[PDB]
Amino acid sequence: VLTQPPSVSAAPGQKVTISCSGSSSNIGNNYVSWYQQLPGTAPKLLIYDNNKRPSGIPDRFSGSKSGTSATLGITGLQTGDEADYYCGTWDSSLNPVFGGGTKLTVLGQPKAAPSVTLFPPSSEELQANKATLVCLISDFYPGAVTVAWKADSSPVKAGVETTTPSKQSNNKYAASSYLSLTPEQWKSHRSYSCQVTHEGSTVEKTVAPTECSG
Amino acid sequence: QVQLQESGPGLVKPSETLSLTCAVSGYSISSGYYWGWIRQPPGKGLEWIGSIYHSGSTYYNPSLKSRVTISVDTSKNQFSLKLSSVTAADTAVYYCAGLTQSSHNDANWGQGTLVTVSSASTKGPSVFPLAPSSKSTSGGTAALGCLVKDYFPEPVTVSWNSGALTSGVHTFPAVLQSSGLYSLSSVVTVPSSSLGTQTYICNVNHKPSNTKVDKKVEPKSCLAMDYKDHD
């Protein structure tokens, strides 16, 4: 009922606008508000009463209203602005109505290689006749990797659970992969490796049941 | 200031009735112009559910087929949502929200609560320490963590040093395994030198089940206690 572009992108430092169009019965007659939503977070009020900012919202955000449409302006675009943005107002029946949402992408972010940390099974887990290797993958960009496990030199496909990468605060992504083994399999190999491939390049980590660092 | 906070079981069986409450603080609930519920299914936009006004009038989204009830309890200073005969279409994050005045649309919003509609049973997690090692040592820092294994449903909350540690702390998004249970890991980066002289514990809370537990996470010693171990 309220329409905004499903997506917008722009380079850092630039000014971007997002609009939602409605009718004289909804937007035309009412205050519009704007919400920012970062990954896994509740919508955050940016603009209310068409153009007011709540305390703590920076003046890089602004609201305006032209007829039966409303517009959110964002200046000095930062990677931290990447989010979904929604307009909200009252519909002609006086009930809440929201735009469909606009996904804002900040272009030209530099490639960043994944940091990888691999943990062997804990002694407690082994004692419970179970074994999990934990491969934690962080701080990469773009947010796509593929993960391969090896037992000694041979590929292991079974017992692998890997997450789709998800956005973090720094707009660097994170992901994890878990390999399930029997305590015997763990204790029978020279080692196991988690191999993370990101944009053509592979970062690898290895753990062995022989390890004892202290 | 005015604060809203949702409560509810994170799990409801199909066809059962979802019951949530919104605790209002910093405000007398009967004063509010408007209280309401909004929800958001995974990866979708925001959907209005229903409303109650100062006058006590209630309005609900027609697409919700008389399944919605919203009430205000002034003695507890909270309002509620009841949504009957749920299906998997009702799996969503649910938000309580409110407007203190008719003359402004600066709404107050809760944090949101995840509701999973599933016949699968609630399962508390098994927690395991992830000991710091030379391999997990980079620079002067050391990674240690906690493996929170096989729970249902989301979410789990993990805290290090009872909130007192927040820097370098990364709690990863959970995996949904083919078994249908979740696992996640929380890692904290610390100074290498503090490893011998600092207590590190992860506090794991799975609200849906009644699971609270905390694992000690400490270095593995690689010297036998019953032999001379120093020059």
Side-chain angles (χ1 to χ4, degrees), chain A residues 35 37 49 86 94-96 122 124-125 130 166 168 178 206 211-212, chain B residues 34 40 48 53 104-105 109 129 135 149 170 173 184-185 215 220 222:
Chain A
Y35 288 89
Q37 180 170 48
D49 287 10
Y86 296 88
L94 311 176
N95 304 128
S122 66
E124 190 194 334
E125 195 186 20
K130 293 174 173 72
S166 93
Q168 241 60 21
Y178 294 88
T206 301
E211 182 188 349
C212 208
Chain B
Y34 174 96
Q40 183 168 40
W48 169 63
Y53 289 76
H104 299 285
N105 73 343
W109 281 65
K135 277 185 171 271
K149 190 184 170 196
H170 191 179
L184 68 72
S185 300
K215 279 297 164 164
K220 178 174 58 169
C222 299

PDB file of all heavy atoms in Angstrom, chain A residues 35 37 49 86 94-96 122 124-125 130 166 168 178 206 211-212, chain B residues 34 40 48 53 104-105 109 129 135 149 170 173 184-185 215 220 222:
ATOM      1  N   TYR A  35      12.149   4.132   9.722  1.00  0.00           N
ATOM      2  CA  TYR A  35      12.844   3.192  10.589  1.00  0.00           C
ATOM      3  C   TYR A  35      14.066   2.588   9.925  1.00  0.00           C
ATOM      4  O   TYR A  35      14.036   2.251   8.748  1.00  0.00           O
ATOM      5  CB  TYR A  35      11.905   2.067  11.028  1.00  0.00           C
ATOM      6  CG  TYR A  35      10.867   2.516  12.011  1.00  0.00           C
ATOM      7  CD1 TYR A  35       9.649   3.021  11.576  1.00  0.00           C
ATOM      8  CD2 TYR A  35      11.102   2.448  13.374  1.00  0.00           C
ATOM      9  CE1 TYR A  35       8.692   3.446  12.473  1.00  0.00           C
ATOM     10  CE2 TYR A  35      10.152   2.867  14.282  1.00  0.00           C
ATOM     11  CZ  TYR A  35       8.946   3.365  13.817  1.00  0.00           C
ATOM     12  OH  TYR A  35       8.000   3.775  14.713  1.00  0.00           O
ATOM     13  N   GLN A  37      16.689  -0.674  10.168  1.00  0.00           N
ATOM     14  CA  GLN A  37      16.812  -1.995  10.768  1.00  0.00           C
ATOM     15  C   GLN A  37      18.117  -2.693  10.374  1.00  0.00           C
ATOM     16  O   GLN A  37      18.284  -3.132   9.237  1.00  0.00           O
ATOM     17  CB  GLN A  37      15.607  -2.876  10.439  1.00  0.00           C
ATOM     18  CG  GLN A  37      15.690  -4.276  11.056  1.00  0.00           C
ATOM     19  CD  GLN A  37      14.392  -5.056  10.939  1.00  0.00           C
ATOM     20  OE1 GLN A  37      13.788  -5.122   9.868  1.00  0.00           O
ATOM     21  NE2 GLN A  37      13.950  -5.638  12.047  1.00  0.00           N
ATOM     22  N   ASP A  49       7.178  12.473  12.869  1.00  0.00           N
ATOM     23  CA  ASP A  49       6.516  13.747  12.558  1.00  0.00           C
ATOM     24  C   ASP A  49       7.046  14.345  11.254  1.00  0.00           C
ATOM     25  O   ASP A  49       7.320  15.546  11.187  1.00  0.00           O
ATOM     26  CB  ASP A  49       6.709  14.757  13.693  1.00  0.00           C
ATOM     27  CG  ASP A  49       5.878  14.432  14.925  1.00  0.00           C
ATOM     28  OD1 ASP A  49       5.288  13.335  14.994  1.00  0.00           O
ATOM     29  OD2 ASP A  49       5.817  15.282  15.837  1.00  0.00           O
ATOM     30  N   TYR A  86      12.493   1.448   6.402  1.00  0.00           N
ATOM     31  CA  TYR A  86      11.041   1.373   6.215  1.00  0.00           C
ATOM     32  C   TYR A  86      10.392   2.700   6.553  1.00  0.00           C
ATOM     33  O   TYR A  86      10.719   3.309   7.573  1.00  0.00           O
ATOM     34  CB  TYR A  86      10.422   0.346   7.169  1.00  0.00           C
ATOM     35  CG  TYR A  86      10.848  -1.086   6.967  1.00  0.00           C
ATOM     36  CD1 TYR A  86      11.981  -1.593   7.600  1.00  0.00           C
ATOM     37  CD2 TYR A  86      10.105  -1.944   6.161  1.00  0.00           C
ATOM     38  CE1 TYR A  86      12.380  -2.911   7.420  1.00  0.00           C
ATOM     39  CE2 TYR A  86      10.492  -3.269   5.982  1.00  0.00           C
ATOM     40  CZ  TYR A  86      11.629  -3.742   6.613  1.00  0.00           C
ATOM     41  OH  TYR A  86      12.011  -5.055   6.432  1.00  0.00           O
ATOM     42  N   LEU A  94      -7.069   4.171   9.421  1.00  0.00           N
ATOM     43  CA  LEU A  94      -6.418   4.583  10.675  1.00  0.00           C
ATOM     44  C   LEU A  94      -5.635   3.468  11.379  1.00  0.00           C
ATOM     45  O   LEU A  94      -5.444   3.506  12.593  1.00  0.00           O
ATOM     46  CB  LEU A  94      -7.402   5.242  11.646  1.00  0.00           C
ATOM     47  CG  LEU A  94      -8.254   6.326  10.983  1.00  0.00           C
ATOM     48  CD1 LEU A  94      -9.275   6.874  11.962  1.00  0.00           C
ATOM     49  CD2 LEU A  94      -7.369   7.422  10.456  1.00  0.00           C
ATOM     50  N   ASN A  95      -5.196   2.482  10.613  1.00  0.00           N
ATOM     51  CA  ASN A  95      -4.344   1.407  11.155  1.00  0.00           C
ATOM     52  C   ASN A  95      -2.908   1.529  10.648  1.00  0.00           C
ATOM     53  O   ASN A  95      -2.664   2.146   9.611  1.00  0.00           O
ATOM     54  CB  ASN A  95      -4.909   0.029  10.793  1.00  0.00           C
ATOM     55  CG  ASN A  95      -6.342  -0.165  11.264  1.00  0.00           C
ATOM     56  OD1 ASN A  95      -7.214  -0.540  10.484  1.00  0.00           O
ATOM     57  ND2 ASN A  95      -6.580   0.050  12.543  1.00  0.00           N
ATOM     58  N   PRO A  96      -1.938   0.948  11.383  1.00  0.00           N
ATOM     59  CA  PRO A  96      -0.541   1.061  10.957  1.00  0.00           C
ATOM     60  C   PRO A  96      -0.315   0.447   9.585  1.00  0.00           C
ATOM     61  O   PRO A  96      -0.861  -0.615   9.285  1.00  0.00           O
ATOM     62  CB  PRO A  96       0.209   0.238  12.008  1.00  0.00           C
ATOM     63  CG  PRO A  96      -0.651   0.334  13.237  1.00  0.00           C
ATOM     64  CD  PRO A  96      -2.063   0.320  12.710  1.00  0.00           C
ATOM     65  N   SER A 122      36.613 -30.711  22.802  1.00  0.00           N
ATOM     66  CA  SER A 122      36.981 -30.599  24.213  1.00  0.00           C
ATOM     67  C   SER A 122      37.141 -31.981  24.869  1.00  0.00           C
ATOM     68  O   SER A 122      36.597 -32.978  24.387  1.00  0.00           O
ATOM     69  CB  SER A 122      35.917 -29.802  24.969  1.00  0.00           C
ATOM     70  OG  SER A 122      34.686 -30.514  25.000  1.00  0.00           O
ATOM     71  N   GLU A 124      35.908 -32.877  27.726  1.00  0.00           N
ATOM     72  CA  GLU A 124      34.578 -33.220  28.227  1.00  0.00           C
ATOM     73  C   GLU A 124      33.695 -33.863  27.153  1.00  0.00           C
ATOM     74  O   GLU A 124      33.059 -34.891  27.392  1.00  0.00           O
ATOM     75  CB  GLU A 124      33.887 -31.994  28.811  1.00  0.00           C
ATOM     76  CG  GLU A 124      32.602 -32.320  29.561  1.00  0.00           C
ATOM     77  CD  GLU A 124      31.738 -31.094  29.858  1.00  0.00           C
ATOM     78  OE1 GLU A 124      32.280 -29.968  29.944  1.00  0.00           O
ATOM     79  OE2 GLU A 124      30.506 -31.262  30.000  1.00  0.00           O
ATOM     80  N   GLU A 125      33.675 -33.273  25.964  1.00  0.00           N
ATOM     81  CA  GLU A 125      32.871 -33.833  24.894  1.00  0.00           C
ATOM     82  C   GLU A 125      33.309 -35.244  24.556  1.00  0.00           C
ATOM     83  O   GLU A 125      32.477 -36.137  24.413  1.00  0.00           O
ATOM     84  CB  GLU A 125      32.909 -32.963  23.641  1.00  0.00           C
ATOM     85  CG  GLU A 125      31.800 -33.334  22.668  1.00  0.00           C
ATOM     86  CD  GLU A 125      31.877 -32.597  21.354  1.00  0.00           C
ATOM     87  OE1 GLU A 125      32.968 -32.089  21.017  1.00  0.00           O
ATOM     88  OE2 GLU A 125      30.839 -32.532  20.659  1.00  0.00           O
ATOM     89  N   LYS A 130      31.436 -38.235  22.288  1.00  0.00           N
ATOM     90  CA  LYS A 130      31.159 -37.368  21.133  1.00  0.00           C
ATOM     91  C   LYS A 130      32.356 -36.485  20.766  1.00  0.00           C
ATOM     92  O   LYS A 130      33.291 -36.338  21.546  1.00  0.00           O
ATOM     93  CB  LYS A 130      29.962 -36.471  21.412  1.00  0.00           C
ATOM     94  CG  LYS A 130      28.626 -37.203  21.535  1.00  0.00           C
ATOM     95  CD  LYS A 130      27.529 -36.231  21.948  1.00  0.00           C
ATOM     96  CE  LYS A 130      26.146 -36.868  21.910  1.00  0.00           C
ATOM     97  NZ  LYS A 130      25.961 -37.847  23.015  1.00  0.00           N
ATOM     98  N   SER A 166      26.451 -14.546   7.541  1.00  0.00           N
ATOM     99  CA  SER A 166      25.534 -13.488   7.950  1.00  0.00           C
ATOM    100  C   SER A 166      26.295 -12.236   8.359  1.00  0.00           C
ATOM    101  O   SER A 166      27.404 -12.313   8.887  1.00  0.00           O
ATOM    102  CB  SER A 166      24.663 -13.944   9.118  1.00  0.00           C
ATOM    103  OG  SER A 166      25.266 -13.557  10.339  1.00  0.00           O
ATOM    104  N   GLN A 168      27.700  -8.949  10.156  1.00  0.00           N
ATOM    105  CA  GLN A 168      28.013  -8.531  11.516  1.00  0.00           C
ATOM    106  C   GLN A 168      28.012  -7.012  11.602  1.00  0.00           C
ATOM    107  O   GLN A 168      27.626  -6.326  10.648  1.00  0.00           O
ATOM    108  CB  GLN A 168      29.375  -9.084  11.958  1.00  0.00           C
ATOM    109  CG  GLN A 168      29.332 -10.003  13.178  1.00  0.00           C
ATOM    110  CD  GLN A 168      28.470 -11.242  12.965  1.00  0.00           C
ATOM    111  OE1 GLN A 168      28.196 -11.641  11.828  1.00  0.00           O
ATOM    112  NE2 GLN A 168      28.028 -11.852  14.063  1.00  0.00           N
ATOM    113  N   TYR A 178      30.846 -26.953  11.461  1.00  0.00           N
ATOM    114  CA  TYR A 178      31.026 -27.907  12.538  1.00  0.00           C
ATOM    115  C   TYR A 178      31.171 -29.284  11.925  1.00  0.00           C
ATOM    116  O   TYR A 178      30.320 -29.706  11.149  1.00  0.00           O
ATOM    117  CB  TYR A 178      29.788 -27.887  13.436  1.00  0.00           C
ATOM    118  CG  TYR A 178      29.603 -26.581  14.170  1.00  0.00           C
ATOM    119  CD1 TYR A 178      28.900 -25.521  13.603  1.00  0.00           C
ATOM    120  CD2 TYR A 178      30.153 -26.406  15.430  1.00  0.00           C
ATOM    121  CE1 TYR A 178      28.751 -24.322  14.285  1.00  0.00           C
ATOM    122  CE2 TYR A 178      30.013 -25.227  16.114  1.00  0.00           C
ATOM    123  CZ  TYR A 178      29.309 -24.185  15.546  1.00  0.00           C
ATOM    124  OH  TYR A 178      29.201 -23.019  16.266  1.00  0.00           O
ATOM    125  N   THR A 206      44.532 -26.295  10.881  1.00  0.00           N
ATOM    126  CA  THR A 206      44.645 -27.718  11.168  1.00  0.00           C
ATOM    127  C   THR A 206      44.671 -27.946  12.677  1.00  0.00           C
ATOM    128  O   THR A 206      45.237 -27.153  13.419  1.00  0.00           O
ATOM    129  CB  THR A 206      45.905 -28.305  10.482  1.00  0.00           C
ATOM    130  OG1 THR A 206      45.816 -28.093   9.064  1.00  0.00           O
ATOM    131  CG2 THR A 206      46.057 -29.798  10.755  1.00  0.00           C
ATOM    132  N   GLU A 211      48.149 -32.688  19.846  1.00  0.00           N
ATOM    133  CA  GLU A 211      48.494 -31.365  20.365  1.00  0.00           C
ATOM    134  C   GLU A 211      48.465 -31.270  21.893  1.00  0.00           C
ATOM    135  O   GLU A 211      47.607 -31.858  22.538  1.00  0.00           O
ATOM    136  CB  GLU A 211      47.543 -30.312  19.768  1.00  0.00           C
ATOM    137  CG  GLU A 211      47.840 -28.881  20.192  1.00  0.00           C
ATOM    138  CD  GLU A 211      46.759 -27.898  19.733  1.00  0.00           C
ATOM    139  OE1 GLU A 211      45.904 -28.299  18.906  1.00  0.00           O
ATOM    140  OE2 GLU A 211      46.761 -26.739  20.210  1.00  0.00           O
ATOM    141  N   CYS A 212      49.415 -30.538  22.464  1.00  0.00           N
ATOM    142  CA  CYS A 212      49.348 -30.165  23.875  1.00  0.00           C
ATOM    143  C   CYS A 212      50.241 -28.952  24.105  1.00  0.00           C
ATOM    144  O   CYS A 212      51.435 -29.089  24.354  1.00  0.00           O
ATOM    145  CB  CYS A 212      49.766 -31.327  24.791  1.00  0.00           C
ATOM    146  SG  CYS A 212      48.980 -31.242  26.437  1.00  0.00           S
TER     147      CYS A 212
ATOM    148  N   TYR B  34      -1.955   4.631  22.448  1.00  0.00           N
ATOM    149  CA  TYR B  34      -1.977   3.499  21.538  1.00  0.00           C
ATOM    150  C   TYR B  34      -0.990   2.424  21.979  1.00  0.00           C
ATOM    151  O   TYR B  34       0.141   2.736  22.337  1.00  0.00           O
ATOM    152  CB  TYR B  34      -1.649   3.973  20.110  1.00  0.00           C
ATOM    153  CG  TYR B  34      -1.503   2.839  19.109  1.00  0.00           C
ATOM    154  CD1 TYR B  34      -2.567   2.461  18.297  1.00  0.00           C
ATOM    155  CD2 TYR B  34      -0.300   2.139  18.988  1.00  0.00           C
ATOM    156  CE1 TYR B  34      -2.437   1.438  17.394  1.00  0.00           C
ATOM    157  CE2 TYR B  34      -0.165   1.100  18.092  1.00  0.00           C
ATOM    158  CZ  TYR B  34      -1.230   0.741  17.307  1.00  0.00           C
ATOM    159  OH  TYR B  34      -1.086  -0.299  16.421  1.00  0.00           O
ATOM    160  N   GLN B  40       7.344  -9.725  12.130  1.00  0.00           N
ATOM    161  CA  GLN B  40       8.210  -9.806  10.974  1.00  0.00           C
ATOM    162  C   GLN B  40       8.711 -11.236  10.790  1.00  0.00           C
ATOM    163  O   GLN B  40       9.559 -11.702  11.557  1.00  0.00           O
ATOM    164  CB  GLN B  40       9.396  -8.877  11.170  1.00  0.00           C
ATOM    165  CG  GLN B  40      10.335  -8.821   9.982  1.00  0.00           C
ATOM    166  CD  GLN B  40      11.314  -7.683  10.100  1.00  0.00           C
ATOM    167  OE1 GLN B  40      11.821  -7.400  11.189  1.00  0.00           O
ATOM    168  NE2 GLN B  40      11.567  -6.998   8.989  1.00  0.00           N
ATOM    169  N   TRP B  48       1.404  -5.335  10.489  1.00  0.00           N
ATOM    170  CA  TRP B  48       0.572  -4.968  11.625  1.00  0.00           C
ATOM    171  C   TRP B  48      -0.304  -6.146  12.042  1.00  0.00           C
ATOM    172  O   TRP B  48      -0.875  -6.841  11.204  1.00  0.00           O
ATOM    173  CB  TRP B  48      -0.290  -3.746  11.273  1.00  0.00           C
ATOM    174  CG  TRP B  48      -1.363  -3.431  12.278  1.00  0.00           C
ATOM    175  CD1 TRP B  48      -1.188  -3.079  13.583  1.00  0.00           C
ATOM    176  CD2 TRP B  48      -2.779  -3.408  12.038  1.00  0.00           C
ATOM    177  NE1 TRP B  48      -2.416  -2.846  14.177  1.00  0.00           N
ATOM    178  CE2 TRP B  48      -3.404  -3.046  13.249  1.00  0.00           C
ATOM    179  CE3 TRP B  48      -3.577  -3.670  10.921  1.00  0.00           C
ATOM    180  CZ2 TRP B  48      -4.794  -2.939  13.372  1.00  0.00           C
ATOM    181  CZ3 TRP B  48      -4.957  -3.562  11.046  1.00  0.00           C
ATOM    182  CH2 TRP B  48      -5.548  -3.198  12.260  1.00  0.00           C
ATOM    183  N   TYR B  53      -6.568   1.120  21.817  1.00  0.00           N
ATOM    184  CA  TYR B  53      -6.486   2.559  22.082  1.00  0.00           C
ATOM    185  C   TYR B  53      -6.816   2.881  23.520  1.00  0.00           C
ATOM    186  O   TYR B  53      -7.323   2.037  24.248  1.00  0.00           O
ATOM    187  CB  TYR B  53      -7.416   3.356  21.138  1.00  0.00           C
ATOM    188  CG  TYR B  53      -6.881   3.354  19.728  1.00  0.00           C
ATOM    189  CD1 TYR B  53      -7.005   2.231  18.933  1.00  0.00           C
ATOM    190  CD2 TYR B  53      -6.218   4.461  19.207  1.00  0.00           C
ATOM    191  CE1 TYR B  53      -6.488   2.198  17.651  1.00  0.00           C
ATOM    192  CE2 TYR B  53      -5.697   4.444  17.920  1.00  0.00           C
ATOM    193  CZ  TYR B  53      -5.838   3.302  17.141  1.00  0.00           C
ATOM    194  OH  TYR B  53      -5.327   3.241  15.855  1.00  0.00           O
ATOM    195  N   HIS B 104       1.710  12.840  18.084  1.00  0.00           N
ATOM    196  CA  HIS B 104       3.051  12.552  17.571  1.00  0.00           C
ATOM    197  C   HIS B 104       3.161  11.081  17.212  1.00  0.00           C
ATOM    198  O   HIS B 104       2.501  10.242  17.825  1.00  0.00           O
ATOM    199  CB  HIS B 104       4.127  12.913  18.596  1.00  0.00           C
ATOM    200  CG  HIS B 104       4.142  14.359  18.977  1.00  0.00           C
ATOM    201  ND1 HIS B 104       4.636  15.343  18.147  1.00  0.00           N
ATOM    202  CD2 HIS B 104       3.708  14.990  20.094  1.00  0.00           C
ATOM    203  CE1 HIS B 104       4.507  16.518  18.736  1.00  0.00           C
ATOM    204  NE2 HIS B 104       3.951  16.332  19.921  1.00  0.00           N
ATOM    205  N   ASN B 105       3.976  10.762  16.215  1.00  0.00           N
ATOM    206  CA  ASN B 105       4.170   9.355  15.871  1.00  0.00           C
ATOM    207  C   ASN B 105       5.553   8.794  16.235  1.00  0.00           C
ATOM    208  O   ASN B 105       6.054   7.877  15.582  1.00  0.00           O
ATOM    209  CB  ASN B 105       3.765   9.049  14.421  1.00  0.00           C
ATOM    210  CG  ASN B 105       4.737   9.592  13.388  1.00  0.00           C
ATOM    211  OD1 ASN B 105       5.560  10.461  13.673  1.00  0.00           O
ATOM    212  ND2 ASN B 105       4.628   9.086  12.162  1.00  0.00           N
ATOM    213  N   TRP B 109       9.198   1.035  20.923  1.00  0.00           N
ATOM    214  CA  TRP B 109       9.215  -0.330  20.429  1.00  0.00           C
ATOM    215  C   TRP B 109       9.947  -1.205  21.444  1.00  0.00           C
ATOM    216  O   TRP B 109      10.910  -0.759  22.077  1.00  0.00           O
ATOM    217  CB  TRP B 109      10.004  -0.403  19.120  1.00  0.00           C
ATOM    218  CG  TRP B 109       9.278   0.051  17.918  1.00  0.00           C
ATOM    219  CD1 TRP B 109       8.821   1.330  17.653  1.00  0.00           C
ATOM    220  CD2 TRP B 109       8.918  -0.742  16.786  1.00  0.00           C
ATOM    221  NE1 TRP B 109       8.204   1.357  16.439  1.00  0.00           N
ATOM    222  CE2 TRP B 109       8.246   0.104  15.882  1.00  0.00           C
ATOM    223  CE3 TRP B 109       9.090  -2.089  16.451  1.00  0.00           C
ATOM    224  CZ2 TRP B 109       7.747  -0.354  14.664  1.00  0.00           C
ATOM    225  CZ3 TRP B 109       8.597  -2.544  15.251  1.00  0.00           C
ATOM    226  CH2 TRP B 109       7.928  -1.678  14.364  1.00  0.00           C
ATOM    227  N   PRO B 129      33.627 -26.336  26.964  1.00  0.00           N
ATOM    228  CA  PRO B 129      34.610 -25.259  26.890  1.00  0.00           C
ATOM    229  C   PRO B 129      35.453 -25.420  25.630  1.00  0.00           C
ATOM    230  O   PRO B 129      35.635 -26.539  25.145  1.00  0.00           O
ATOM    231  CB  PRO B 129      35.454 -25.484  28.147  1.00  0.00           C
ATOM    232  CG  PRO B 129      35.414 -26.962  28.333  1.00  0.00           C
ATOM    233  CD  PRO B 129      34.067 -27.432  27.842  1.00  0.00           C
ATOM    234  N   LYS B 135      47.830 -22.397  19.221  1.00  0.00           N
ATOM    235  CA  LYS B 135      47.218 -22.206  17.909  1.00  0.00           C
ATOM    236  C   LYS B 135      46.189 -21.076  17.938  1.00  0.00           C
ATOM    237  O   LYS B 135      46.067 -20.316  16.973  1.00  0.00           O
ATOM    238  CB  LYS B 135      46.575 -23.502  17.405  1.00  0.00           C
ATOM    239  CG  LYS B 135      47.545 -24.461  16.725  1.00  0.00           C
ATOM    240  CD  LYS B 135      46.810 -25.655  16.136  1.00  0.00           C
ATOM    241  CE  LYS B 135      47.736 -26.508  15.271  1.00  0.00           C
ATOM    242  NZ  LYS B 135      47.760 -26.060  13.844  1.00  0.00           N
ATOM    243  N   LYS B 149      25.750 -26.572  22.268  1.00  0.00           N
ATOM    244  CA  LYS B 149      25.441 -27.629  21.324  1.00  0.00           C
ATOM    245  C   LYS B 149      24.017 -28.197  21.454  1.00  0.00           C
ATOM    246  O   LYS B 149      23.535 -28.454  22.554  1.00  0.00           O
ATOM    247  CB  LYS B 149      26.486 -28.736  21.523  1.00  0.00           C
ATOM    248  CG  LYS B 149      26.516 -29.825  20.504  1.00  0.00           C
ATOM    249  CD  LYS B 149      27.537 -30.841  20.967  1.00  0.00           C
ATOM    250  CE  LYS B 149      27.501 -32.101  20.148  1.00  0.00           C
ATOM    251  NZ  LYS B 149      28.221 -33.189  20.878  1.00  0.00           N
ATOM    252  N   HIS B 170      32.850 -12.313  20.503  1.00  0.00           N
ATOM    253  CA  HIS B 170      32.064 -12.582  19.310  1.00  0.00           C
ATOM    254  C   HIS B 170      31.236 -13.846  19.508  1.00  0.00           C
ATOM    255  O   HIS B 170      31.775 -14.949  19.633  1.00  0.00           O
ATOM    256  CB  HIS B 170      32.977 -12.709  18.089  1.00  0.00           C
ATOM    257  CG  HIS B 170      32.243 -12.729  16.783  1.00  0.00           C
ATOM    258  ND1 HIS B 170      32.891 -12.812  15.566  1.00  0.00           N
ATOM    259  CD2 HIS B 170      30.921 -12.670  16.497  1.00  0.00           C
ATOM    260  CE1 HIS B 170      31.998 -12.806  14.593  1.00  0.00           C
ATOM    261  NE2 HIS B 170      30.794 -12.725  15.131  1.00  0.00           N
ATOM    262  N   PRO B 173      26.453 -16.522  14.822  1.00  0.00           N
ATOM    263  CA  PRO B 173      25.094 -16.984  14.541  1.00  0.00           C
ATOM    264  C   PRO B 173      25.061 -18.503  14.555  1.00  0.00           C
ATOM    265  O   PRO B 173      26.054 -19.160  14.210  1.00  0.00           O
ATOM    266  CB  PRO B 173      24.811 -16.444  13.129  1.00  0.00           C
ATOM    267  CG  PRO B 173      25.814 -15.340  12.926  1.00  0.00           C
ATOM    268  CD  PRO B 173      27.027 -15.774  13.691  1.00  0.00           C
ATOM    269  N   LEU B 184      25.750 -23.188  18.431  1.00  0.00           N
ATOM    270  CA  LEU B 184      26.541 -21.993  18.160  1.00  0.00           C
ATOM    271  C   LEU B 184      27.794 -21.989  19.019  1.00  0.00           C
ATOM    272  O   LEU B 184      27.960 -22.826  19.911  1.00  0.00           O
ATOM    273  CB  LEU B 184      25.711 -20.694  18.362  1.00  0.00           C
ATOM    274  CG  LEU B 184      25.228 -20.265  19.759  1.00  0.00           C
ATOM    275  CD1 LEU B 184      26.344 -19.752  20.667  1.00  0.00           C
ATOM    276  CD2 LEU B 184      24.133 -19.189  19.636  1.00  0.00           C
ATOM    277  N   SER B 185      28.667 -21.026  18.749  1.00  0.00           N
ATOM    278  CA  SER B 185      29.871 -20.846  19.538  1.00  0.00           C
ATOM    279  C   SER B 185      30.045 -19.385  19.872  1.00  0.00           C
ATOM    280  O   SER B 185      29.751 -18.512  19.054  1.00  0.00           O
ATOM    281  CB  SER B 185      31.114 -21.342  18.781  1.00  0.00           C
ATOM    282  OG  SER B 185      31.006 -22.716  18.472  1.00  0.00           O
ATOM    283  N   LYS B 215      30.125 -22.918  31.897  1.00  0.00           N
ATOM    284  CA  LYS B 215      31.343 -23.713  31.872  1.00  0.00           C
ATOM    285  C   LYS B 215      32.544 -22.866  32.232  1.00  0.00           C
ATOM    286  O   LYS B 215      32.662 -21.708  31.820  1.00  0.00           O
ATOM    287  CB  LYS B 215      31.566 -24.379  30.509  1.00  0.00           C
ATOM    288  CG  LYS B 215      30.767 -25.652  30.298  1.00  0.00           C
ATOM    289  CD  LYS B 215      31.157 -26.737  31.285  1.00  0.00           C
ATOM    290  CE  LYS B 215      30.099 -27.823  31.321  1.00  0.00           C
ATOM    291  NZ  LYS B 215      30.581 -29.071  31.969  1.00  0.00           N
ATOM    292  N   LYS B 220      44.621 -26.062  29.146  1.00  0.00           N
ATOM    293  CA  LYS B 220      44.999 -27.427  29.451  1.00  0.00           C
ATOM    294  C   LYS B 220      46.448 -27.401  29.918  1.00  0.00           C
ATOM    295  O   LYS B 220      47.299 -26.813  29.259  1.00  0.00           O
ATOM    296  CB  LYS B 220      44.863 -28.283  28.193  1.00  0.00           C
ATOM    297  CG  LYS B 220      45.274 -29.724  28.361  1.00  0.00           C
ATOM    298  CD  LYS B 220      44.972 -30.511  27.102  1.00  0.00           C
ATOM    299  CE  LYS B 220      45.685 -29.926  25.886  1.00  0.00           C
ATOM    300  NZ  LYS B 220      45.615 -30.834  24.689  1.00  0.00           N
ATOM    301  N   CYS B 222      49.978 -29.184  30.319  1.00  0.00           N
ATOM    302  CA  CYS B 222      50.639 -30.297  29.644  1.00  0.00           C
ATOM    303  C   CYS B 222      51.840 -30.746  30.445  1.00  0.00           C
ATOM    304  O   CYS B 222      52.826 -31.240  29.892  1.00  0.00           O
ATOM    305  CB  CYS B 222      51.030 -29.917  28.220  1.00  0.00           C
ATOM    306  SG  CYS B 222      49.575 -29.472  27.213  1.00  0.00           S
TER     307      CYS B 222
END
